[PDB]
Amino acid sequence: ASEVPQVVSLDPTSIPIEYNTPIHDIKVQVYDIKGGCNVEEGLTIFLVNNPGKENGPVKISSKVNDKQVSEFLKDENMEKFNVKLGTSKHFYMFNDNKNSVAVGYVGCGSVADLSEADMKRVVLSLVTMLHDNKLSKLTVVFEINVDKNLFRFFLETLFYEYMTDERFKSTDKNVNMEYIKHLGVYINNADTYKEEVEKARVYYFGTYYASQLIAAPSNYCNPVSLSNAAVELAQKLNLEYKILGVKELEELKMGAYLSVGKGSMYPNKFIHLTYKSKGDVKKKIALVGKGITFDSGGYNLKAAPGSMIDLMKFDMSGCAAVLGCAYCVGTLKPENVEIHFLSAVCENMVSKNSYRPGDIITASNGKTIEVGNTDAEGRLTLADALVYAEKLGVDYIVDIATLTGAMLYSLGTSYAGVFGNNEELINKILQSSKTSNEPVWWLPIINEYRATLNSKYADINQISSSVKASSIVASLFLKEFVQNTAWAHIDIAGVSWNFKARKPKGFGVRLLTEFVLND
Amino acid sequence: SEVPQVVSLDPTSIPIEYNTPIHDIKVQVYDIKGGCNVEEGLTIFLVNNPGKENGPVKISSKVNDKQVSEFLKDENMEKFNVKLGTSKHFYMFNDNKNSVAVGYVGCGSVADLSEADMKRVVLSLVTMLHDNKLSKLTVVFEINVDKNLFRFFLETLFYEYMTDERFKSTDKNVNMEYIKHLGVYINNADTYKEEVEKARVYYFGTYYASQLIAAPSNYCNPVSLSNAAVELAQKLNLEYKILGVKELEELKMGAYLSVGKGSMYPNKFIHLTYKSKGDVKKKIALVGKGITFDSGGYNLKAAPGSMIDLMKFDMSGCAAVLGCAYCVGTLKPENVEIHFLSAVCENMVSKNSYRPGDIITASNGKTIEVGNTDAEGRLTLADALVYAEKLGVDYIVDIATLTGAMLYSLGTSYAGVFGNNEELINKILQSSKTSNEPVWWLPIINEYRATLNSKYADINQISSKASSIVASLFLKEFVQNTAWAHIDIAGVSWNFKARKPKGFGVRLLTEFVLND
Amino acid sequence: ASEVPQVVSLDPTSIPIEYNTPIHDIKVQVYDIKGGCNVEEGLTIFLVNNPGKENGPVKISSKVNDKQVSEFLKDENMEKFNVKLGTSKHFYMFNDNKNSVAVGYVGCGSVADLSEADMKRVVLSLVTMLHDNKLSKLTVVFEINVDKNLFRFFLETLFYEYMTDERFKSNMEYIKHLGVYINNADTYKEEVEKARVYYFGTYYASQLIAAPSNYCNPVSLSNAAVELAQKLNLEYKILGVKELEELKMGAYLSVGKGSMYPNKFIHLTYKSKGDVKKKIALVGKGITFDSGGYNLKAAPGSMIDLMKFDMSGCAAVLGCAYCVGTLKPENVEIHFLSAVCENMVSKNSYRPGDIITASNGKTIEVGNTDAEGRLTLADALVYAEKLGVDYIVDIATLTGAMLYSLGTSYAGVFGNNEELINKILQSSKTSNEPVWWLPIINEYRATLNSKYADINQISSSVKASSIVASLFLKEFVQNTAWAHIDIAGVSWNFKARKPKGFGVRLLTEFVLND
Ligand SMILES: CC(C)(C)CC(=O)N[C@@H](C(=O)NO)c1ccc(-c2cc(F)c(F)c(F)c2)cc1
Ligand SMILES: CC(C)(C)CC(=O)N[C@@H](C(=O)NO)c1ccc(-c2cc(F)c(F)c(F)c2)cc1
Ligand SMILES: CC(C)(C)CC(=O)N[C@@H](C(=O)NO)c1ccc(-c2cc(F)c(F)c(F)c2)cc1
Ligand SMILES: [Zn+2]
Ligand SMILES: [Zn+2]
Ligand SMILES: [Zn+2]
Ligand SMILES: [Zn+2]
Ligand SMILES: [Zn+2]
Ligand SMILES: [Zn+2]
């Protein structure tokens, strides 16, 4: 734990973190739908669809253990409503014990298998029913088909979207902020789905924890304060930790990493968390996250129209995702595995002490790098991070980074891109993507472009000057720093930020965790 | 107090000229009914011709000289016309057989000169003063002007006549000589006499503001500017207080302190106070934006036409307030208590600078999400407006070079005024009429308030296009229950044609204080 | 009706126009709230606030004549919800007679005085429920404070936002009944049919604007004007290129030169049956598409894809023409004018630097082809003052600077006559179409001095474009009271991706209460 430097005494010296969220107070009960649905206090929502019939009528199929509610929800009354994806309706009636109840439904389209995006729409429609309504209990009746992974995804998404981050609110807190205390779920073959509930709660927070870190502004979330939070997290989870300061980094000759942070008031802090299983270890994995707490661009300042310099607190999303994974792994405690969580945290700033364009710097593997652009600082920090990671002697090195903005032009805001030197590892990422429902796509490392990184003076150029394929060029650059290890690179620069909702996604936490677990 | 330097050659004070050549001018006002004596220097007639556009010049005044009167007869003067801005020089011998200079400046055919027309008239008259080493100027008024317009003539004459040579060195004007005497002829002269010394007060306050603004950022930094304000206060016997960083920290001014975090100069909060002897009926707080230099911060002014080299003008609001302070302290109005405020700092790029995206806390507890570092003015004004309201005043009037959007709305002549109180706005509009400083009332549109709703903080700093209106909506959030008005002078502060400050707002704020 | 030229046989030859809308089929009843409410049919929505507590709990005061709904509306239930402006909830249930009804609310904030901006948010919340409604009846219970004008605004807005334009397409059902419970109902009833007239006047203008440039061209726009005039029994006249050349409208014609569509000048006339006491000319800018000419809109943010909207001034005048010809005010004679053309890049286009001559003889030096609206208005104004009217009011999407000045909500008004400007402002207040008075600063006039022509079209330096354009237009009105309304910023609703029909009601209130 290191002291955070301040310019004025009003400068924050730590990131506020909410561990005990209202979600953790919610008691979750899972009932088998065969036994019928009890409709009591709170709000009972049925998830219905109508296969084939686009915007077809609503039909409740479950047994409802109440004569009154059954009559209300009979087919001929429900037919005036439809199952259009995103549609919702509220019902009000009295049950058999003469107690008023609130019932409703959410349309789930006319397609049998809902994609992760469709399910997210259903959750969002469901969440609006939770907002501005002081409910004590929510009951969800699944009348659609979901496998165990999609059921978990439903819960995680619900917990995430329902949650509101009011850490930075002061005079403008929602005076009506009131969370439900009970969640009931009716589903076919409930005994098989029950194991997903706690996994969802663990996945939710790991995602929401990374979200809190990302959403934290660059004056709260700096290299020192972020490394402090990693320490606290590790102390709560009994993870081994090591926080490397500038001096050790100099001794390890991390010249590429150090140059990036030269222009910052905050000293570089290299984060090293370690989870090791108690049993015999059969797999060693290093998970690397890019940790630029603020990216001004350096002397290559982000001043072009649309450079979104104000959003650049998000450039440690990779680090956040890695730390969120550290929570999920340290909590669920997988066996036969050893995971290193790495992040070379620093801050790309403009100063008299900054690194300059044209500077030639030496990485910790001896390779000299000519800087052609100070705004491509991520691949520099990752270079030293990758070399460090390989010295640990692992089987897999996976890095996750908000690296290139060109991802928005290639995959957009929904799908992340994965690059690598090992096809087996890449397939495991794609498999992890399926089971976590965090969309990833395999993109090529095109060797024909490697020649454009040939520097006249240094061993290698940082950027190309004749190739607009930035995501591939950067992957080619990073590949030059992994000598003999299966390695994959996930570019989340396009998917890390939910633009419509103006908030982080916490993308990668579940993806990386499903990777650790299913191995 | 002590100005920090990078090298020894860095200046540690703003050069300021108090005793200007204008203050060495003896001003005499005579009644035109007794006629004009024409003996020495240059004598200029302000003549018009109501109706006839570009009509003939006719000297109506009685001239107490046979030879000069003969020269100025209609027969001789018919060849000249009264087109606004026209000037002619005449050369002749008077009765004493002394050569003498006589001329005129045409004042159009409209019987009511406006603020713009009178400025053209003065400018022409000033051109007759430049490059002509004269010891005396007499001006004969053959037009109809009210007391406030006659005063505006003098203030403007004095302002345009004076040349700022504080930073001249090997290029000082070798031929620059100022007149030592000024004569004025006008109808009902006893009425206009009091306006003379009021004009000299109004002029210097405007020129004092002009000097501070023109002073470059390496000369005019927050420390040197707060030093100057103290020097001003000590001269005028005003109560003064300069709040430094650690005091500001205690007052929790996080917004204002964040803006200045990057600068090598400590933040300095200027607090001057004039208090009349006797019963105070009105308590007023005047707030001036005091950014000694606006680089833009990490949102650097690097766009084409961002005019970063002119950014020394972002202290103009503060200058206007200090200029007003001189006027008020000199004229000493009664039954009022005036607080002169300016949260002075510099907006720089550094490892210590505030960033786009920072969530800062204002002194009233509201958390603000910083969308753009170049919108730093409203951040400093936020803490200043809270401090001001804490003084229990009746009126808060802030003046600021806030938004460049003003150039597209009102332009370079008219300032914009916003507010939460219609009575206060009208008073500003009234003072605009009497100070002859053009000001237009622009609305604070409440529908736009939603665009400032922040996801994480209490409020957004910027809306991420009606910048001026949005900036006012922001400032409204820091005035709880006081009549408040906001004057945006970003477009009218600088005279691009003359390449110099206007000192805009000094006379406006003084007229507001005096006539209240 | 002139023939609309085509490049291919697939190019349309008229603007699709819906006159009979489902809104005209809605039967409206206004009851007094002091008598209580009947909630036995369809959707009932309470407009409630909480002046005492910001985002405070919902409490329904009205007594309803149904036991089931009375239980639903008890304070224990409603306090689970809050009145945050725009927030809404609605529930389906059975009433006492076992009929299906729906009951809900819309939060109206904690301020007793509702602005038109606030009311618009309330209506939008209401409409969102209507777009998911299949019920036959909507009942709106006003448990808040509205005067006669804001209530009419509520109806016009409700109608306008409810109606959806589907002329170019290749869920819900429109209600047949609207019930309203409000205090002093008898005083409000007169505002209903006025709201229906104002609605279609606005929606008609909306239809013209939204109609794309391949549909809405000078020939088809003027054709629709003729058809509107015939339906309302207005005197009309469409001046063609030959008549325009005779009248020497060289500024107007220079803009259209590069277009495949011949310039058309629209002149509609309403005249009262009795004695004519006031004469008015309403002038609308009618650029059916603004490419920018050789000063092409290629800069980032120039938004060339939206420039079908630059005839919004023309549409608003035609929209007003509908209301006037329908409401038939006495003692007035109104002229509806628009010099309609298209600003295109061609070998025939006018060029930057061209010196053109207006119908009043003034030579103009063109500095920017993208500033073509003021050129066409210049000749239109000269035409307007020749009619011998008391008031000339032009309305135009003139300068993008309005977005930086007043924004997207308030229009700017400029003029030479303070009395006319006040009437505009008063019309703005009664119609709830917000306008703000901006100055015509004479000091800027010198920037329009041309070296070779009588006057410059634009300024080289001055960025106060809205003011500079006003000074320009001022040179084409010799001695008639004249006002200019710049709606370049308020014409298009960007959040809803559709026109606002801005100006119709403002202009109609102007002619009706003058
Ligand atoms: C290859 C380079 C440095 C010339 C351009 C680039 O890819 N820049 C990166 C960057 O600065 N990484 O440290 C970059 C990454 C994300 C974004 C980005 C911009 C947005 F406006 C946005 F919404 C987003 F999600 C990402 C922009 C640039
Ligand atoms: C709202 C924002 C920050 C996007 C653009 C803005 O209004 N900037 C202000 C500013 O920096 N306030 O601290 C601003 C104010 C005046 C001017 C300005 C520019 C000129 F070229 C000019 F001549 C002038 F007089 C003022 C430019 C920007
Ligand atoms: C004076 C000039 C031509 C340099 C810039 C200008 O004011 N152009 C006008 C125009 O082309 N009139 O025919 C103009 C008017 C509205 C808009 C405009 C732009 C928007 F992005 C927008 F959303 C809007 F509503 C209007 C842009 C330019
Ligand atoms: Zn970067
Ligand atoms: Zn980066
Ligand atoms: Zn700025
Ligand atoms: Zn500023
Ligand atoms: Zn145009
Ligand atoms: Zn146009």
The CATH number of the domain holding residue B389 is: 3.40.630.10
Interface test with C, best of A44, A45, A92, A131 (most C CBs within 10 A): A92
Asked if residue C242 and residue C145 are part of one domain, the reply reads no
Catalytic residue among C374, C423, C474, C505: C374
Which residues have CB under 6 Å of ligand 1? Answer: A 295, 306, 308, 311, 373, 375-378, 403-406, 408, 470, 493-494, 497
DSSP string of B80-142?
-B--TT-EEEEEEE-TTS-EEEEEEEE--S-SS--HHHHHHHHHHHHHTTTTS--SEEEEEE-
Q: Of the candidates C377, C246, C230, which has an alpha carbon nearest to the alpha carbon of residue C313? A: C377
Considering the domain boundaries, does residue C14 fall inside one? Answer: no
Of A167, A190, A217, the residue at which a domain comes to its end is A217
Considering the domain boundaries, does residue B5 fall inside one? Answer: no
Asked if residue C239 and residue C191 are part of one domain, the reply reads no
- Measured CA to CA in angstroms, residue A237 lies from A222, A227, A316, A331 at distances of 23, 15, 22, 7
Q: B345 CA distance to ligand 6 centroid (A)?
A: 12
Return the sign of the alpha-carbon dihedral for residues C423, C426, C430, C432: positive
Q: The tokens of C217 are what?
A: 């061209």
Asked if residue C33 and residue C44 are part of one domain, the reply reads yes
List all residues 6 or more positions away from B70 whose beta carbon is below 8 Å from its beta carbon.
Answer: none
Binding residue per annotation — C277? no
Ligand 2 atom nearest the C-alpha of B305 is 21
Asked if residue C242 and residue C137 are part of one domain, the reply reads no
Residue C167 designated active-site? no
Rounded to 5°, the CA angle C210-C216-C220 comes to 140
Ligand 2 atom nearest the C-alpha of B296 is 11
Residue type, B174: V
Contact assessment for residue A518 and residue A435, using Cβ atoms and an 8 Å cutoff: yes
Instruction: Give the count of alpha carbons within 13 A of C216, CB side only.
Output: 29
Asked if residue A171 and residue A68 are part of one domain, the reply reads yes
DSSP H stretches of helix in B128-188 = 147-161
Asked if residue C208 and residue C244 are part of one domain, the reply reads no
Which of C404, C405, C407 is facing B448, going by the closest CB pair?
C407
Q: Of the candidates C491, C481, C492, C484, which has an alpha carbon nearest to the alpha carbon of residue C466? A: C484
The total number of residues written for chain C in this structure: 514
Return the sign of the alpha-carbon dihedral for residues C119, C125, C131, C137: negative
Asked if residue C260 and residue C154 are part of one domain, the reply reads no
Contact assessment for residue A308 and residue A298, using Cβ atoms and an 8 Å cutoff: no
What is chain C's alpha carbon radius of gyration, rounded to the nearest angstrom? 25
Closest-approach residue (CA) in chain C for A306:
C300
Ligand 3 atom nearest the C-alpha of C492 is 25
Q: Which ligand is closest to the CA of B471, given by its number?
A: 2
DSSP symbol at A304 = S
DSSP symbol at B56 = B
Q: How far does the CA of residue B396 sit from the closest CA of chain A (Å)?
A: 23
DSSP string of A391-434?
HT--SEEEEEE---TTHHHHTTTT-EEEEES-HHHHHHHHHHHH
Catalytic residue among C176, C297, C362, C445: C297
Of C212, C232, C265, the residue at which a domain comes to its end is C212
Question: Alpha-carbon distance A167 to C424, whole Å?
Answer: 48
Give the mutation target among C345, C397, C466, C497 for probing the ligand 3 site: most ligand atoms within 8 A of CB.
C397
Residue type, B404: G
Considering the domain boundaries, does residue A4 fall inside one? Answer: no
Answer whether C72 sits within 8 Å of A92, measured CB to CB: yes
Question: Alpha-carbon distance A431 to A515, whole Å?
Answer: 8
Contact assessment for residue A321 and residue A495, using Cβ atoms and an 8 Å cutoff: no
Q: Which ligand is closest to the CA of B291, given by its number?
A: 7
The total number of residues written for chain A in this structure: 519
Q: C306 CA distance to ligand 3 centroid (A)?
A: 11
Residue type, A480: E
Considering the domain boundaries, does residue C341 fall inside one? Answer: yes
B270: exposed, middle or buried (Cβ count in 10 Å: 0-12, 13-18, 19+): buried
Question: Alpha-carbon distance C82 to A132, whole Å?
Answer: 7
Residue with tokens 């060849």: B79
How do C455-456 and C363-365 pair as beta strands?
parallel
List the residue whose alpha carbon is closest to atom 6 of ligand 2. Answer: B403
Binding residue per annotation — C297? yes
H or E element at residue A491? strand A486-491
Which residues in B lie closer than 8 A to residue A303 (C-beta atoms)?
A: 299-300, 302-303
User: Across the strands, what pairs with C93?
Assistant: C101
Considering the domain boundaries, does residue A7 fall inside one? Answer: no
Contact assessment for residue A204 and residue A156, using Cβ atoms and an 8 Å cutoff: yes
Q: Of the candidates C317, C345, C41, which has an alpha carbon nearest to the alpha carbon of residue C202? A: C317
3-state secondary structure of B28: strand
Q: The tokens of A28 are what?
A: 């979750």
How do A368-370 and A269-276 pair as beta strands?
unpaired
Q: The tokens of B195 are what?
A: 């306006």
Query: Which stretches does DSSP call E strand in B136-209?
Result: 136-141, 181-186
Question: Alpha-carbon distance C177 to C186, whole Å?
Answer: 18
Considering the domain boundaries, does residue A255 fall inside one? Answer: yes
Residue type, C422: N
Total number of domains constituting chain C: 2
Chain C contact present for A169, CB below 8 A: no
B–C: how many Cβ contacts below 8 A? 73
Question: Alpha-carbon distance C300 to B78, whole Å?
Answer: 58
H or E element at residue A384? helix A378-391
The total number of residues written for chain B in this structure: 516
Contact assessment for residue C105 and residue C58, using Cβ atoms and an 8 Å cutoff: yes
Dihedral of the alpha carbons of B57, B58, B64, B69, in degrees to the nearest 10: 70
DSSP string of B495-510?
ETTTTEE--TTHHHHH
Q: What are phi and psi of C139, to 5 degrees?
A: -115, 125
A22: exposed, middle or buried (Cβ count in 10 Å: 0-12, 13-18, 19+): middle
User: Across the strands, what pairs with B290?
Assistant: B344
Contact assessment for residue B322 and residue B268, using Cβ atoms and an 8 Å cutoff: no
H or E element at residue A258? helix A255-261
Contact assessment for residue B351 and residue A265, using Cβ atoms and an 8 Å cutoff: yes
Considering the domain boundaries, does residue C286 fall inside one? Answer: yes
Which residues in C lie closer than 8 A to residue B448 (C-beta atoms)?
A: 407, 409
User: Across the strands, what pairs with A170?
Assistant: none
Resolution of the structure, angstroms: 2.3
Q: Which ligand is closest to the CA of B306, given by its number?
A: 2
Neighbours of ion ligand 6 (CB under 5 A): B 294, 374
Question: Alpha-carbon distance C224 to C288, whole Å?
Answer: 13
Q: Would you tell me how many other CB atoms lie within 10 Å of the CB of residue A304?
A: 12
3-state secondary structure of A272: strand
Asked if residue B31 and residue B56 are part of one domain, the reply reads yes
Contact assessment for residue B179 and residue B133, using Cβ atoms and an 8 Å cutoff: no
Asked if residue B211 and residue B353 are part of one domain, the reply reads no
Interface test with B, best of C118, C463, C467 (most B CBs within 10 A): C463
Chain C contact present for A167, CB below 8 A: no
Adjacency order of strands within the sheet including B87-93: B26-31, B181-186, B136-141, B42-47, B99-106, B87-93
Considering the domain boundaries, does residue B6 fall inside one? Answer: no
- Measured CA to CA in angstroms, residue B230 lies from B240, B272, B340, B387 at distances of 7, 8, 12, 19
Asked if residue B283 and residue B200 are part of one domain, the reply reads no
3-state percent helix, strand, coil for chain A, nearest multiple of 5? 35, 20, 45
Residue type, B407: L
Q: What are phi and psi of A206, to 5 degrees?
A: -55, -40
CATH number at residue B193: 3.40.220.10
Question: Alpha-carbon distance C142 to C46, whole Å?
Answer: 6
List all residues 6 or more positions away from A307 whose beta carbon is below 8 Å from its beta carbon.
Answer: A297
Query: Which stretches does DSSP call E strand in B316-472?
Result: 336-347, 359-361, 367-369, 395-400, 415-419, 439-441, 459-460
Query: Which stretches does DSSP call E strand in A70-113?
Result: 88-94, 100-107
3-state secondary structure of B55: coil
Contact assessment for residue B347 and residue B373, using Cβ atoms and an 8 Å cutoff: yes
Binding residue per annotation — C394? no
List the residue whose alpha carbon is closest to atom 25 of ligand 1. Answer: A494
Q: The tokens of B37 are what?
A: 């004596």
Of B172, B194, B216, the residue at which a domain comes to its end is B216
Residue with tokens 């002859």: B436
Asked if residue C154 and residue C279 are part of one domain, the reply reads no
Domain that holds residue C49: 20-212
Question: Alpha-carbon distance B95 to B35, whole Å?
Answer: 15
Asked if residue A513 and residue A393 are part of one domain, the reply reads yes
Q: Of the candidates A92, A305, A132, A312, which has an alpha carbon nearest to the alpha carbon of residue A221? A: A312
Contact assessment for residue C507 and residue C314, using Cβ atoms and an 8 Å cutoff: no
Q: Would you tell me how many other CB atoms lie within 10 Å of the CB of residue C295?
A: 19
Rounded to 5°, the CA angle C198-C200-C206 comes to 110
Contact assessment for residue A342 and residue A287, using Cβ atoms and an 8 Å cutoff: yes
Question: Alpha-carbon distance C202 to C317, whole Å?
Answer: 10
* Chain centre to alpha carbon of residue B85: 24
Q: Of the candidates C372, C314, C341, which has an alpha carbon nearest to the alpha carbon of residue C259? A: C341
Question: Alpha-carbon distance C324 to C234, whole Å?
Answer: 10
For ligand 2, say whether the CB of B375 is within 6 Å of any of its atoms.
yes
Question: Alpha-carbon distance C55 to C108, whole Å?
Answer: 10
Q: Of the candidates B264, B255, B240, B496, which has an alpha carbon nearest to the alpha carbon of residue B369? A: B255
Question: Alpha-carbon distance A283 to A289, whole Å?
Answer: 20
Q: The tokens of C309 are what?
A: 């909207």
Question: Alpha-carbon distance B505 to B435, whole Å?
Answer: 9
Ligand 2 atom nearest the C-alpha of B377 is 13
User: Across the strands, what pairs with A241?
Assistant: A273
Which residues in B lie closer than 8 A to residue C486 (C-beta atoms)?
A: none
Residue with tokens 């088998």: A32
3-state secondary structure of A126: helix
Question: Alpha-carbon distance C430 to C52, whole Å?
Answer: 29
Q: A347 CA distance to ligand 5 centroid (A)?
A: 9
Answer whether A175 sits within 8 Å of C54, measured CB to CB: yes
Burial B463-494 (b: 16+ CB within 10 A, else e): bebbbbbbbbbbbbbbbeebbbbbbbbbbbbb
Q: The tokens of B305 are what?
A: 């036409």
Ligand 1 atom nearest the C-alpha of A403 is 12
List all residues 6 or more positions away from A227 whose beta carbon is below 8 Å from its beta carbon.
Answer: A2, A243, A269, A271, A345
Contact assessment for residue A90 and residue A104, using Cβ atoms and an 8 Å cutoff: yes
Question: Alpha-carbon distance C360 to C247, whole Å?
Answer: 9
Closest-approach residue (CA) in chain C for B446:
C117
Q: Which residues of B are catalytic?
A: 301, 378
DSSP string of C170-198?
------SEEEEEETTHHHHTHHHHHHHHH
How were these coordinates obtained? X-ray
Question: Alpha-carbon distance C156 to C162, whole Å?
Answer: 10
Give the mutation target among C399, C410, C484 for probing the ligand 3 site: most ligand atoms within 8 A of CB.
C399
Question: Alpha-carbon distance C337 to C460, whole Å?
Answer: 30
